[model samples]
Target chain A: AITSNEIGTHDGYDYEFWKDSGGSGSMTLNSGGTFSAQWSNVNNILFRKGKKFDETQTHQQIGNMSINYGATYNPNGNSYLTVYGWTVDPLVEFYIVDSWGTWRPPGGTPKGTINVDGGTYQIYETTRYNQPSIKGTATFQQYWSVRTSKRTSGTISVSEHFRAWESLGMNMGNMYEVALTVEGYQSSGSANVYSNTLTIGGQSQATRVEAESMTKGGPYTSNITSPFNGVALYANGDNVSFNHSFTKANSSFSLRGASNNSNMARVDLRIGGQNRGTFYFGDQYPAVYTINNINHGIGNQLVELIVTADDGTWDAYLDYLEIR
Target chain B: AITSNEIGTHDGYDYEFWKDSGGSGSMTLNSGGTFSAQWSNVNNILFRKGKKFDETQTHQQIGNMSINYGATYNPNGNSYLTVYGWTVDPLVEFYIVDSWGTWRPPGGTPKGTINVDGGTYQIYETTRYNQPSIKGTATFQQYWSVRTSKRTSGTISVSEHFRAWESLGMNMGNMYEVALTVEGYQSSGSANVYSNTLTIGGQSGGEQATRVEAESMTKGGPYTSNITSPFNGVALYANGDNVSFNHSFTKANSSFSLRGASNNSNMARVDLRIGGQNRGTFYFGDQYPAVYTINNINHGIGNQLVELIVTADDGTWDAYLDYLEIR
Candidate 1:
């Protein structure tokens, strides 16, 4: 059993853990980096801290995993199992509080709902006060599951929640700290986080369609392309092209890309010198555009993706193309 | 403008109105029994009281009518427009509060959700203290609208909320008093309820399924009953007593009840054991009548044996029942 404050590694797990000046608690870090806590009269503090990532972070990159055994704690206090962080401009918290009685700061407006990880959650756009660094209030977009009849003790894909929030304009800053904590205020009674597990910091396992994988034509800017999971950066062009030869034709295919500005980014698909169609991307971020029922030289021929800035001073960030 | 307490009819409407101590409010009785209020510092008082009736109270008796007006008060205090009352053992309240900062008594579990009144409501089974004529606390079942985005100011079918609550086991006391009023608790505001219209107290509109309207069937022991609101009043009955309703109900129908007891007279499971074939039983106190759908009665013409036995006999008590509804 060990007790400490601030960021540190105990037993084999990393934590930005905390406890009140006069409070007391004990922790037993178990095998596989899982841990349990037993404490009383403690200004509760618990979390697994990690480096922050942008909205493009994937599940594997975060070593996404968690298992909640059980806990006997104050019924009216607060306990959480979530990933929290401050991404420069906005402080983000994506978590589920098991038993909470703290004043849920009021005046929150409902934004609607989102379905992710086989669960439906009601989303709210609210604000929080008093943070560490930039001592100011921040905007909070929270997703709460409606039916919480029982305690949740299982695995949830943390990236999916982040991905959903990103689609809804949540700036999930560099996720500097991610923890599953049991927090309290004037809280009595003891909490036994019977078994808790949170894994972080692994690798990037993103599916890739590199720019160099396709034949390039036309003068494009050297915007430092990523060999793995990077945008094929491009500038205004009438003759810029990326062509790839497939062994067989798929029934459908999707092309993903985004424009530098808010305006439409148009691309032309050519197969066997025949114009398939001109696809448009005008959304604020990368979007998938599909081409269905292609009966061409079935993967044995070349498919060309050609883009010209729809406007004079425009550019495109072509991500990748997926075919099925 | 008036200031008094307990049952009184104002200028142009008929209602048994009430206001708590240190309470003050004005009423303007308009045409068709609809009125308005502009009050302040009232502890709590308001309701349009109603008598016991089956589901047909809106159409037949209380010529269903209502209106909407405007009001601007302190947006930071306690105020409400609601219908509240007590049957006997159960206390009920259905309302919408506008700008409330009053302490709502805590300690209640969420029962579930109900949809009514053009909206969905979260129902709670709670308790209240120090009611008039009652020594201690009472079980209070309340229905609160899920969304309070805006204050309501229009016609709303008041009975629908009650109907929905009944389906969820809410004992909406033999609805003695049903009123819509702005209530306050140490609150100071002027609420002007205007351009309102509501009608009260009319004729019975319950569908007929009994062979004879309000007929006291043979073998029924000594019990006073109601024919107007449509219920057979049975004061007391033992093992050898039962009532029957003969009707040609094609499929299924329902029966209503008003179980009256005084001095804590306990009525056992008032059973419709034989005909409805022991489908279910209902226990009642001195509460308003409620509708109970009889599901066991199969299709075609039939006779229903409504049986009753005083499971806990203390004497001098009665059970009032409305005959079966076929339509």
Candidate 2:
């Protein structure tokens, strides 16, 4: 374990309080014989409670560390992997499976399978960690993102943890900058290895931007019926239940006049033939008009006003209407 | 009669033809008076074949011209109005309402009220010269617009006919220019006049530009809603039906994005979301992805389409949606 003021430091200094006796260990690679150091509580790195390892008092010892330890396997066919990390948080758990895709880091496989052979996921239990204190005094927790190479065999998972007290910048908090590497060697000569880190901080917030429109496809209707000309009083058997629907919503409409004398006609809203309001327009393009709720009732109202020459021939085209 | 090439003078011309003449034997206007003109057969003026009045026609004598013509009423309540020229067409009819509201043009007023208390109106009527002749062989016709001013009395409307013919290069088949002066007598005892013209023609194709918005007045739905994250579900339209498995919805600027449905904010279009066919995106202002595809249909054989807006909202607003396409 690293000490305060001595943190981020690798060169050892005065050890009047503690001592480190170098010991040997190994993790042999598949047929390669490249092995890493193993763990032994005494001479090896140990993670425990209290300001420093208390030789006088018997406190909690959750986990230990395997320094400079790592291995490589040719995850050619099938493989199994079990990873471990030191923590005071009882919630510290681990898993061995692919969440994104095959391989572990950098390269090898792009996609990862769900679990080993897509089977049930294996979660680390309380017993997964070497026994010590179950009292939850300063328990550590861990999470994992595991994967394997799809075309080949081999799997890997990396995990690390922090304790409530240690996470709060206590003596045990040194684990924040540390991690454990693990790999699975398939019998088919395939191998997998993983290396990653975990960040310890507060919560944060994010932002998003987007766009939208009414006529996404092509065929759209722009209601261009004259507000005054759209209305037609029933003469004898004329229908009165006629109505129109505006596909979308918007605030205004525009009119681009087409012709001079034969152009789109204009109409005036009238009550009993007595003019109420005049909608004078010659624009060929449809122009947006304000909807008068007082004039137009609840539901969508269709404008059906008409203009006929002395000889009685109708003239304007009511395109579809849009609303926003 | 001001026969063809009859040596006469008008505005300065020496030789002119008597093209037309006739009225209330003697005519005049005190304040407001109006007349409609048509050019069905009116091909010219002076040396022109078709015109309103021919000062040389002995039989087509001008009675109204002998009386003192009233000063034009300037619509702006001014005291003076400039008078250019006025003419009426052949058989067609229009109303020449006097300031007293008396209907004096074409077919006289029958049942409708003719008591004009000083109000401006567009006097009009279509002319069909393609029909039978008028007054024996005197075949005459013309199109019309009006020019007159305020007068509750002394207003007369005569169905004037063209008497002579001379091609003034004016095409009867093509469009011709007609001008008239609008004279009005304001309550200030001054004359106000304005002149505007109209060229008769026909209709054409689709729209050039447009703006439209959907609003619920006197009801409730006019505010905007905030959408924190992308919601995958269905949007229930005001029409009762709903779109299922929609990718996203936004509340920021009152825009709802339809996945697999592309649209232009202000244009004419139709979006079709086939059961599992062509899929596109419906963009909000400029281009913002609001929704994404969640899944495809398993059994259905149709599409999930919607009619979006071609025009944008005047400001921020909220739209509603309903539906979740999940098993």
Candidate 3:
């Protein structure tokens, strides 16, 4: 009474639970079912219904099962993956599961594909720098960025650039990693996921920042004028000591910027915790007027005058200041 | 009655002159008569003296000659030569006339004794440079330096050394000339009479200061400090810039020696003056003061921020007004 394409609706699929009926030690297929093996664990252990097959009884994950069985499953309609950092092309196939468990090549393997849309895929030689390289598990943050009206439509595009650098993880030796993330601008809501992975030995981890859009303001940039007149010595050579007192007679004070409007930022003259002072240097280029505008306490104290300039995107060049 | 250490002065010897002798230029001795050649020009021109020879249509300065006849004039003992940068040595010999006018070496052609102590001589090389070379005559100061020291001291000492250098009008590249000032150190109250003609040809220019010592108060020897933050760059390559910027900061800075130390002299700066109120500096170590207080007219008009840095020395740096431009 078996029909041709009838998949009786039982409960849902519970692949993680079927260790009895020889599903563990020996693979026991349904009346006339086939079995497949997936390598896991250190010894290449296989699983049947989510259980390791025991080989003592001549039945293991590697055993062959011959049974005439076949069925077709609908594709659940919307089962597709949006990838990033990978090349975009038509012929590229990605893996997607239909109602019928089948391994279909979706966006294709990372080996082939051209005309990348987001950024680029580069091949780097990782020898000279030790095994646990400075580049630990590569990370990818898919940040959503905006394009000008003069560009495409009002839709947001992903960052078109990519960068690779020595991962500064507070002096971690050897164990290294790298990650990546990317997104593209589609006409409608349709988008593809960007994917990339790096492996040193077996351990691996990754994350991705998705794409978001902005319609107003612009990018970020900064300039620090006179970072010296504060107290730090601009050393010219090694073993040099420029120790001169400072007073109003030789001190200059200024903080200015250009083309920068509103953004998340804080500028400070930090010495440990004590503030030489702090200001929001993200306003305008010619923006003058600072707190202590005289050569008061600049040349007396031994200090490290630092300016923390951050605008998420826009950067600044800290110029001179007065010091002692 | 011929003459045996004879005392027949006959009122000091007189000179007897002749035209040309020796059938070509020889002179015949008359045993007791005297003769002499008179120098009528400021610089006299001499020729063979006699009465028989011909071919003296024109006269010329005689290099050397031989005399066989007559007696010698007293020469007044007052006639002397004044030559500068002259060469004098025992090897430098010359012939002279006796009371008999006989031509012979001053001391019997050297089998007797030779003294260049006060002998008249000529200059061999008019001007000597780092390396002596022949050059045409040019205007120069001829110094008759008789001793190493500038002033003359009474009573000459034989052991005393004398040397002089002529400031030749031209240079022979790098070489220099040396001359001995062998007179006047020990003055005898009366001026030493150096007789006759002296031929000089060269002089020497003294030592010249070649370079300016740059390093003054350098810090640790041979080691320069690492250039830390604050600069977009530093002209550390010593590319002849006021900026002490360089990528190879691990390397050392250009070094210079500090002179005037021998005399305990303190030199503030040794440099080429560029212009008015403007000068570049190169220091031995880091500047004493990293920061300076400035006012509107601290340096000059619009002179607000004045920066100082080092140059080629271990810490060659400079200082400049903030208001001025360094283009």
Candidate 3 docking quality: incorrect, acceptable, medium or high: incorrect
Specify the highest-TM-score model's number.
1
- Candidate no. 2 TM-score: 0.16
lDDT string for model 2 (A1-324, tens) is: 121001111001011011122322223211111112222222322211111121221112212221122233333322323333332322333333332213443233222223433332323222223211111112344333343332222222221212222333322212222233323222223223221111111111221111011121112222323432222211221111223343222112221211123232443332233333323233333333222211221235443222322122223333322222
**lDDT scores in order:** 0.44, 0.23, 0.19
Q: Show model 1 residue runs off by greater than 4 Å.
A: A1-324, B10-13, B47-76, B89-109, B133-147, B195-327
lDDT per residue as tens, model 3, A1-324: 110101111011101111111111222112101122221111111111111111121111112111111222122222211111111111111111111112222222232221123323321111112111011112221211111111111111111111111121111111111111111111111111111111111110121111011011123222223431111111211011123343222222233222133231234443333545443333223233233222223244322223333323433323333331
What would the per-residue lDDT of candidate 2 be over residues B247-309, giving only the tens digit for each residue? Answer: 221110111223211122221111223343433222222112222222222222222332322
How do these models rank on TM-score, best leading? 1, 2, 3
Better of 2 and 3 by TM-score: 2
Predicted candidate 3 versus true structure: per-residue lDDT over B36-129, tens digit per residue: 2222211111122122112221111111111122212222222211111212211111112111111111221111211223432121222222
Model 1, B125-198: lDDT tens per residue?
55444332211122345554322334546544455545555677765554333444555566655554543333
- The candidate, 1 or 3, that scores higher on lDDT is 1
Q: What are the runs in model 3 whose C-alpha is more than 4 Å off?
A: A1-324, B1-180, B183-282, B289-327
Writing each residue's lDDT as its tens digit, candidate 1 over A55-161 gives: 34333333433333345544345444433444443445555433444433123554455564445554455554432222122245434322132344554445555
